[PDB]
Amino acid sequence: MEAVDANSLAQAKEAAIKELKQYGIGDYYIKLINNAKTVEGVESLKNEILKALPTE
């Protein structure tokens, strides 16, 4: 209730998950996102998982 931090935060993820669905990645990462408290890491979270999807 500061201004619009929660609104923009929900988008970084809400929007970051859309890519996970459009990409085909696992829902694990779509969820692991919503678990975040901030946002800067939320968006980079999935985009980072994509930077190295085929990992060990």
From TrEMBL:
This is Protein L. The chain holds residues 798 to 839 of 992 of the full protein.
